[PDB]
Structure formats: structure tokens, C-alpha cells
């Protein structure tokens, strides 16, 4: 009884870029995790911390929904203690990650003809991002000694680049809409289970 709908995230119309990922704070409602487990419409389903089947008997305080789309070959880079391009420059996971990440192929609704320019991913940064960090920045990157702000050329690099997603792409170069659920535990009581 008294369900709250979660279809505005998994069945959402449109996502955002990886460096502009959204967060959806969820509390004081009812989860239906067995349905999304038995959906069997996702190519990747790794649920860290707990067993994916018998997790339904335990519920936590808060769940934050994070949504982004990546290429089909960096799907292994979303993991605790894992390096890579987007792992170290777009989305960093904590080492003691107990969350739950879901990924599936999404070329047939987002990869139109000629590629889509609506998604941007960060290339250059001084160091690796901290775990659970967002960078909402359009700053041109400085890759040398001369200042790089309002100027282009050598070492004045734009850190954000688009994605080329043609319908004739191979299995390793397809847009995968990736959603991850972060589980929170604190002195506040658990709220979301049923």
C-alpha cells in the first residue's frame, strides 16, 4: 500500500551529461527493487555491498539516484578502486562502495544519425576527482605555462568533447544509459522499503 513512483528516473525521457549528473534524494516512500531486478532488460547489473537477490529484507535511510550515459566500453570503469578515463576524470567511486549500478544499451533511442552533440565528457584535469564529486564547469583547460582563458591554440584545451554515436557503431562504441543507486546509513531511521 501507498506506493511512490520511481519511473521518472529509470524510464525518464532525457538524461544529462556525465559531468552534469543529477541527484534525486528519495525518502519516506516504498521501493520495489524485486521488479527492477527481475526486469531482465539490462545488460549490466552489478549491485555492490549486498547480495542482489536477498537485499529486499533490508532497507536503508536514503537513496540518491544518479543518471548519466557513457560509451559501451567504459562500463567496467564504474567500480570501487577502478581507474580509467571517466573513472578518474568524470565520475569517481568510493573504495568502500556499497551502492547498486544498473546499465543497459540505449543506442536505439539516443544514437541518431551522425552522432549526438548533446552529451559532453571531461578530458583534462589537474588530478583525479574525489569520490562523489560533481564539477559544473565550462573553464577552458590550461595545459602549459601561458594562461589559457579566452584564448585557444597550443595547450589551451577545451576539456569537454562530444560523442560520435552513429547507428552503425559496434558493440563497444554505443551509448549506455547508466544509473547507480547510492545507499545511505546514519542515525536517521530507514525509510524506503516495502
Amino acid at each position, epitope marked *: 500500500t501507498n506506493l511512490c513512483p520511481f519511473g521518472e528516473v529509470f524510464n525518464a525521457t532525457r538524461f544529462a551529461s556525465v559531468y552534469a549528473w543529477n541527484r534525486k534524494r528519495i525518502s519516506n516512500c516504498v521501493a520495489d527493487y524485486s521488479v527492477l531486478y527481475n526486469s531482465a532488460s539490462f545488460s549490466t547489473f552489478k549491485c555492490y555491498g549486498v547480495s542482489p537477490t536477498k537485499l529486499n529484507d533490508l532497507c536503508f535511510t536514503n537513496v540518491y539516484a544518479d543518471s548519466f550515459v557513457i560509451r559501451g566500453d567504459e562500463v567496467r570503469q564504474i567500480a570501487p578502486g577502478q*581507474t*580509467g*578515463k571517466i573513472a*578518474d*576524470y568524470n565520475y569517481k567511486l568510493p573504495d568502500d562502495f556499497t551502492g547498486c549500478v544498473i546499465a543497459w544499451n540505449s543506442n536505439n533511442l539516443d544514437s541518431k544519425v551522425g552522432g549526438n552533440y548533446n552529451y559532453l565528457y571531461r*578530458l*583534462f*584535469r*589537474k*588530478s*583525479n*576527482l574525489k569520490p562523489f564529486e560533481r564539477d559544473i564547469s565550462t573553464e577552458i583547460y590550461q*595545459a*602549459g*605555462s601561458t594562461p589559457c582563458n579566452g584564448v585557444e591554440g*597550443f*595547450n589551451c584545451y577545451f576539456p569537454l*568533447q562530444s560523442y560520435g554515436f552513429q547507428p552503425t557503431n559496434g558493440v563497444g562504441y554505443q551509448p549506455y544509459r547508466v544509473v547507480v543507486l547510492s545507499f545511505e546509513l546514519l542515525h536517521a531511521p530507514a525509510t524506503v522499503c516495502g
Partner: nanobody, 120 residues
Framework: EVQLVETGGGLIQPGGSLRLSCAVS????????MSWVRQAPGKGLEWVSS???????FYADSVKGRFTISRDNSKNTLYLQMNSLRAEDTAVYYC??????????????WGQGTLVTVSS
């Protein structure tokens, strides 16, 4: 201008070790995208390893673990401490800077080349 220094060729044996160096001008080794590539007779422009600007490193299949990547921030130069090699490492290794990505990252620069002589 960007200059490149490839030195470290010499009489080497498999299982042993030596040291390799790459020197650059303009940008800095600890902040740009560098990638190691090699050329051998009977072999193409074979990618070796790469270092990321955030501190992470990545190698190929046959060179991971044995080799290590090294760099000095203030010296603006890069190092390859070749350790515990094999006989099949006879090649010419080139230092380069990867711009983007692909099968190999696009290198706007090529090293001057040093030929590894694994011979006893």
C-alpha cells in the same frame, strides 16, 4: 617548440634492467597526456603504455607489471625504468603525446627513437 630526447640504447640481456628517459619542452610531463609507443621490424606502431594527468597509469598486456612509469615534475622530463624484460623486447621505443583517443591516441609528436638491443 617541443623537443624530444630518446636515449638508453645499449647492450642488454633479458630478465635484467636498465633505465629510459624522455625529455620535453613547452608543456610539463606531470600535467599532459603522455603515451609510450614502439616500432620494431616485423611490427607496426605498437603502443606500449600511457600515463594519465591525474596520476593514474596504464600499460599493455605484455608489459604490465614488469615495467614501471616514472616522471619528475620540476625536471619536465619523463622516465621509463625498464625492469625484468624479455628477449622479445628488441624494438625502437618512441616517446609521444596523446591528444585524444582511438585505437591509439593521436600523437602530434614522434620521438627520435632508441633501438633496444636485447643481446648477450
Amino acid at each position: 617548440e617541443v623537443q624530444l630526447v630518446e636515449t638508453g640504447g645499449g647492450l642488454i640481456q633479458p630478465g635484467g634492467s636498465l633505465r629510459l628517459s624522455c625529455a620535453v619542452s613547452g608543456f610539463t610531463v606531470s600535467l599532459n597526456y603522455m603515451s609510450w609507443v614502439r616500432q620494431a621490424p616485423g611490427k607496426g606502431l605498437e603502443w606500449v603504455s600511457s600515463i594519465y594527468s591525474g596520476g593514474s597509469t596504464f600499460y599493455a598486456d605484455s608489459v604490465k607489471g614488469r615495467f614501471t612509469i616514472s616522471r619528475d615534475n620540476s625536471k619536465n622530463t619523463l622516465y621509463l625504468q625498464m625492469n625484468s624484460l624479455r628477449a622479445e623486447d628488441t624494438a625502437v621505443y618512441y616517446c609521444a603525446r596523446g591528444l585524444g583517443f582511438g585505437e591509439l591516441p593521436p600523437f602530434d609528436f614522434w620521438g627520435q627513437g632508441t633501438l633496444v638491443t636485447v643481446s648477450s
